[PDB]
Amino acid sequence: SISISYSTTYSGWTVADYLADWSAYFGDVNARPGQVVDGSNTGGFNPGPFDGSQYALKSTASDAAFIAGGDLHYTLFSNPSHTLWGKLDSIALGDTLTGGASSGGYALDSQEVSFSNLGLDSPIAQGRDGTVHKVVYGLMSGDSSALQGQIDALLKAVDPSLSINSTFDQLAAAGVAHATPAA
Amino acid sequence: SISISYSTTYSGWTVADYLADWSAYFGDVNARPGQVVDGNTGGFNPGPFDGSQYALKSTASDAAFIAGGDLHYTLFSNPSHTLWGKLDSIALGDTLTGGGYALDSQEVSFSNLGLDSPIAQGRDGTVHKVVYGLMSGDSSALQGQIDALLKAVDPSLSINSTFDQLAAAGVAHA
Numbered sequence A: 001s002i003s004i005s006y007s008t009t010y011s012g013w014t015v016a017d018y019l020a021d022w023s024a025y026f027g028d029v030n031a032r033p034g035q036v037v038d039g040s041n042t043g044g045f046n047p048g049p050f051d052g053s054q055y056a057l058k059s060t061a062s063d064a065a066f067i068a069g070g071d072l073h074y075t076l077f078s079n080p081s082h083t084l085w086g087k088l089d090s091i092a093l094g095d096t097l098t099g100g101a102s103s104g105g106y107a108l109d110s111q112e113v114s115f116s117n118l119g120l121d122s123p124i125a126q127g128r129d130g131t132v133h134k135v136v137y138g139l140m141s142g143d144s145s146a147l148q149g150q151i152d153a154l155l156k157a158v159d160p161s162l163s164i165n166s167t168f169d170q171l172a173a174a175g176v177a178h179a180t181p182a183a
Numbered sequence B: 001s002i003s004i005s006y007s008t009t010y011s012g013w014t015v016a017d018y019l020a021d022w023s024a025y026f027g028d029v030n031a032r033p034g035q036v037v038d039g040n041t042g043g044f045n046p047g048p049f050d051g052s053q054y055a056l057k058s059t060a061s062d063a064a065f066i067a068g069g070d071l072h073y074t075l076f077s078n079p080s081h082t083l084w085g086k087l088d089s090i091a092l093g094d095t096l097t098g099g100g101y102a103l104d105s106q107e108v109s110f111s112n113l114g115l116d117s118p119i120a121q122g123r124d125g126t127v128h129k130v131v132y133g134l135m136s137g138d139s140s141a142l143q144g145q146i147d148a149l150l151k152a153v154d155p156s157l158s159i160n161s162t163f164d165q166l167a168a169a170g171v172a173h174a
């Protein structure tokens, strides 16, 4: 079953509302006035260059960032071309990337929400139609819609009364989610 | 002015014939005799989307290149998917190492290219055309720029000059 961590900052938010906010912030720092854009320009595969246990990317319009964790592979020009595939265990969303292979992995300076124990696995044979590819490809431009669809399905699998319209508070009460430090 | 280094293997080759051979080999390992594919490696240094180098190896063979300068890739920023900035050098050879990046077998390098494309030109920039072409082993854009630079030293020089002739003209070095 999916497990979720959320910053205390977002306790009262629905998952959908949170994802819309992260996506808006990825598109424009001014969706969160008061923020600065000064994160290191870092990211990629860990260890890379085209495979790793993490793939991480930061916006260049803001410090919004994600980290995909699992056992991931990118085909580049090999068939099926431009496919990210493998096992996707977690998606963590927040602000500012730090780290990399040389310091124990990528991290977020502020982790806002992390969706873990996802159990997603896309074989190479599915190419760009794989769920892993669609989720991560969306996030590279700040589009959380594919991620949102998967989170909704995974929550409903726990209990059909849970959904992306549940608040993090409600998911905690249901035993799926727990709070982490302020963002 | 442009400066060229070349393996003596290509002393009597013309620049155009060498580029055609590297491109052919980028496309098919069988394009050269007795070669084996055994080198995916490359990217920006430092990256992820900007660097003093961008390097890539073929998937069909170990043919590879390294672009050197002050390079930027826009990803989704307008104009989207544009590689721009200053391109000072292109090195061509076989098999990538490192990540600065280097070639196991460096065959030819073209340096002091003096190319500079602003972001506003988007994918029409010369830098973009040169490097993007080489990502699929297409050396035509590179070749046209080399030809212009050679003629700027002297109109009698060209991509149909041999490397030895360019050495005699003070532009190339074995």
Ligand code: HEM
Binding pocket: A045, A049, A050, A055, A074, A076, A081, A082, A083, A084, A128, A133, A136, A137, A140, B043, B135
């Ligand atoms: C890791 C470093 C990466 C590099 C160097 C890279 C490189 C490229 C290049 C050069 C192209 C253009 C190909 C062309 O038309 O000439 C491309 C296209 C594409 N890339 Fe990647 N990419 C990377 C990562 C990713 C990741 C992680 C994803 C997905 C999660 C992705 C998804 C795609 C897609 C979907 C296309 C368009 C395919 C099409 O519609 O033809 N890329 N990439």
Ligand code: HEM
Binding pocket: A140, B044, B048, B049, B054, B073, B075, B081, B082, B083, B123, B128, B131, B132, B135
């Ligand atoms: C540095 C890592 C790179 C990544 C992560 C990357 C990623 C991508 C992605 C995801 C797309 C598809 C866009 C979409 O479907 O909305 C794309 C397309 C493209 N990429 Fe990149 N790319 C990289 C490097 C490069 C480089 C270095 C060049 C040029 C030298 C390049 C040239 C292109 C071009 C021209 C397209 C559009 C292809 C088309 O629509 O025909 N890419 N890239």
